[PDB]
């Protein structure tokens, strides 16, 4: 039986891989940090909020000028802001009022959205006549589509509940590489500066770091107990958090392929939604069941400040590319900029 | 007012835009939303012909009231992970096939049908987004009840059976015994069919709960109950 | 395609009566706001009238109040001029003007073809262009200067002026919108820069296709004033 001889082989090679992760560790991030100043204390006042959605805020994204915004809402409408005057540029009604994500091009010119319909919709911002279309649907995805991100204005990455992450090419509206070996619904994605590599965050418990014009997964990083809803690149692309059910972040290292901090407190019993970094690197903040959001110190793992002010669950988070701001969407249909 | 003419315009575009994002709102809140759920395939097609890839929505009105009814069928997914997006609905209707007390899923030999269709239901129901919401139970096929039940008896499904051996006393243990996994019963309340009628009926049962569940829902916001 | 037919032009005898239609074709006629700009045959562009999206704002020039009427109708795509008392001053080309306005929108994109109407018998921003004729050999660069009498540098940061062509028998078209930005479909070779009231329009690598005169707008208050207009030639 060529079974037990081939699961021996991975169970040890397992055990090898373990072996080599525990003799490269020689002093912990605690270990290193503990002689720093530490940040203090971090008072951010809510300077906008934004009104006008009338159900649950899934995802926002921000865009690359750090001043326009989209949400999506179970309306089953797209709204753009405009986070300096708290006006609504436009309002894009959706075929499907399941969605669950949304982007924005870096170049401002596409926005992308999909859902419960099984289908990435891509939509023409700017158009000779004056309304925004849709350019491409693409199907293909057999589940859930749970986040989409851009690489340009022409490819598309996409995550779903099918155990599947794919690549797109809009411009013919078909799938140039897929991406397998999760065993779980993938929920979250994160795209690397370079725009090369990009993390995955399934229910197994488990996050696959992906090489983008390879479809290849380079390693797999696990710790986590419980599902894992959010992911994020430290700014220098060496580095992601993570978030899950078991109400604790992570921090993981691409270069030493293990793990480096984990951010967990008493009082804190409940799933994290939405995790993000600040343009420094230093504040990791992170988005709670519990109603507010906890910004933390990345190198030192004690707690720096809340964000309170949300009625229900905050369900997605941004910083601005200047890192001036932060917005979060809660399930009471409101954003907020913080600074 | 220290704001140029675009910028004047630009608020006028979004006042506009905010007077259309309301009148959509209101429009939409007086729309019916139904989940329509079924282990299997047990009479969720016949139900949707009757009133006729991912998530099905299908449209009807009658008598002035907008339906709006989703099928979450062939989503072959983790279900916690999208079942609070269905939180604000206003009941879920479920459907059990009354003729698979005798069949077995082929997927476990030794698990019973109605005993999956009994377990999902505990699910469902028991869940926390759904802590106040109705559900409307149709059973189906109860002439293929009532014409294999001759043949054989309820006992197999149900061991602990001591009735007699007819129609309508087992059907209605049936439906005591789904009734009966109401673990939420201060809070919401199960309405049950017996829908193997091929005239226009079953529709009429479901405005008829829909109105009782409005009327509850109104009632308990003003307080009266 | 995007296209502005206008109708109910003529020949009309002074102190009467007349209205021209602006049929709208190929976009979202609810969403853009309309201009109407007329160009008497003294080659200048003057400021009409102007009704934003749902009918909520409207403007007139000093010269058309209580003379000139403005109305749209949504469901038949048509922009209606409803003239009154009219005088030899009226005579002019009327065009139907096309804007949007939000956030990095580009207002004035389009103009119609526009319609002759012929009659028998300040606080404003002034703006002007010193230079009425530029002779030229194409493959040089032409540097075209239009000041303005108030700083159009708003305490939000953008600079509201606009450049315009209009090719010989043709209509006008848009080059840069806010004193930097390329208008959609214009090439690469004409930049534009300048900072409070000095503005400079540059054409590098000229060819016989901009031949034309280039004119100068400004969008900060209200009456919007062009300027006399620099013409290229050869």
């Known amino acids: 039986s060529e079974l037990d001889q081939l699961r021996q082989e991975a169970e040890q090679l397992k055990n090898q891989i373990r072996d080599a992760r525990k003799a490269c560790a020689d002093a912990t991030l605690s270990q290193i940090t503990n002689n720093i100043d530490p940040v203090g204390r971090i008072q951010m006042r809510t300077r906008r909020t934004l009104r006008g959605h009338l159900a649950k805020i899934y995802a926002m994204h921000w865009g690359t000028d750090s001043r326009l915004l989209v949400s999506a809402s179970q309306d089953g409408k797209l709204i753009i802001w405009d986070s300096y005057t708290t006006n609504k540029v436009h309002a894009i009604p959706l075929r499907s009022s399941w969605v669950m994500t949304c982007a924005y091009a870096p170049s401002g010119n596409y926005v992308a959205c999909g859902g419960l319909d099984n289908i990435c919709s891509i939509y023409n911002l700017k158009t000779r006549e004056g309304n925004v279309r849709v350019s491409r649907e693409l199907a293909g995805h057999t589940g859930y589509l749970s986040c989409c991100r851009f690489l340009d204005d022409n490819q598309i990455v996409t995550s779903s509940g099918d155990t599947t992450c794919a690549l797109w090419d809009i411009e013919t509206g078909q799938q140039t590489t897929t991406f397998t070996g999760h065993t779980g619904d993938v929920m979250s994605l994160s795209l690397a500066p370079d725009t090369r590599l990009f993390v995955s965050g399934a229910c197994d418990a488990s996050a696959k770091l992906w090489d983008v014009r390879e479809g290849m997964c380079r390693q797999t990083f696990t710790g986590h107990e419980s599902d894992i809803n959010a992911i994020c690149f430290f700014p220098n692309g060496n580095a992601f958090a993570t978030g899950s059910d078991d109400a604790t972040c992570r921090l993981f290292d691409l270069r030493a392929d293990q793990e480096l901090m984990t951010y967990s407190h008493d009082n804190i019993i409940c799933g994290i939604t939405s995790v993000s970094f600040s343009k420094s690197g230093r504040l990791l903040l992170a988005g709670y069941d519990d109603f507010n959001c906890n910004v933390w110190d990345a190198l030192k793992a004690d707690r720096a400040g809340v964000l309170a002010g949300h009625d229900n669950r905050v369900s997605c988070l941004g910083v601005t590319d200047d890192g001036m701001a932060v917005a979060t969407g809660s399930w009471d249909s409101f954003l907020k900029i913080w600074n | 007012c220290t704001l140029s003419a675009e910028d004047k315009a630009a608020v006028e575009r979004s006042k506009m835009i905010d007077r259309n994002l309301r009148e959509d709102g209101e429009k939409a809140a007086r729309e019916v939303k139904l989940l329509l759920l079924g282990a299997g395939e047990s009479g969720k097609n016949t139900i949707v012909k009757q009133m006729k890839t991912g998530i099905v929505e299908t449209h009807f009105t009658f008598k002035d009231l907008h339906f709006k009814m989703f099928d979450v069928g062939a989503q072959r997914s983790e279900r916690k992970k999208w079942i609070h997006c269905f939180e604000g609905v206003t009941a879920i209707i479920f459907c059990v096939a009354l003729s698979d007390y005798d069949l077995v899923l082929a997927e476990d030999e030794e698990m019973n049908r109605m005993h999956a269709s009994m377990k999902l239901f505990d699910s469902i129901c028991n869940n926390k987004w759904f802590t106040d919401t109705s559900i409307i139970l149709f059973l189906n096929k109860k002439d293929l009840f009532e014409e294999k039940i001759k043949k054989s008896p309820l006992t197999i499904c149900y061991p602990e059976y001591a009735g007699s051996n007819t129609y309508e006393e087992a059907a209605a243990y049936i439906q005591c015994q789904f009734e009966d996994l109401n673990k939420r019963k201060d809070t919401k309340e199960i309405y049950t069919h017996f829908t193997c009628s091929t005239d226009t009926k079953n529709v009429q049962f479901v405005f008829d709960a829909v109105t009782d569940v409005i009327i509850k829902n109104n009632l308990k916001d003003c307080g009266l109950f | 395609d995007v296209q502005l037919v206008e109708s109910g032009g003529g020949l009309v005898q002074p102190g009467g009566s007349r209205k021209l239609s602006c049929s709208a074709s190929?976009?979202?006629?609810?969403?853009?706001?309309m201009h109407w700009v007329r160009q008497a045959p003294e080659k200048g562009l003057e400021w009409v009238a102007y009704?934003?999206?749902?009918?909520?704002?409207?403007y007139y020039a000093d010269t058309v109040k209580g003379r000139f009427t403005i109305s749209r109708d949504d469901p038949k795509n048509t922009l209606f001029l409803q003239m009154t008392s009219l005088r030899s001053e009226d005579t002019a080309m009327y065009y139907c003007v096309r804007s949007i306005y939000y956030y990095g929108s580009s207002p004035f994109d389009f103009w119609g073809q526009g319609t002759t109407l012929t009659v028998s018998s300040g606080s404003d921003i002034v703006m002007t262009q010193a230079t009425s004729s530029v002779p030229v050999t194409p493959g040089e660069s032409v540097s075209i200067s239009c000041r303005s009498s108030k700083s159009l540098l708003h305490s939000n940061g953008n600079t509201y002026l606009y450049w315009f062509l209009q090719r010989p028998g043709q209509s006008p078209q848009l080059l840069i919108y806010?004193?930097?930005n390329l208008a959609s479909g214009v090439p690469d070779r004409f930049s534009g820069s300048g900072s409070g009231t000095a503005f400079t329009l540059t054409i590098s690598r000229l060819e016989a296709e901009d031949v034309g005169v280039y004119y100068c707008?400004?969008?900060?208050?209200?009456?919007?004033?062009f300027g006399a207009g620099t013409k290229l030639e050869l």
């Open positions: 190929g976009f979202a006629f609810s969403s853009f706001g």
């Open positions: 806010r004193m930097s």
């Open positions: 707008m400004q969008h900060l208050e209200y009456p919007l004033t």
């Open positions: 009704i934003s999206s749902g009918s909520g704002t409207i």
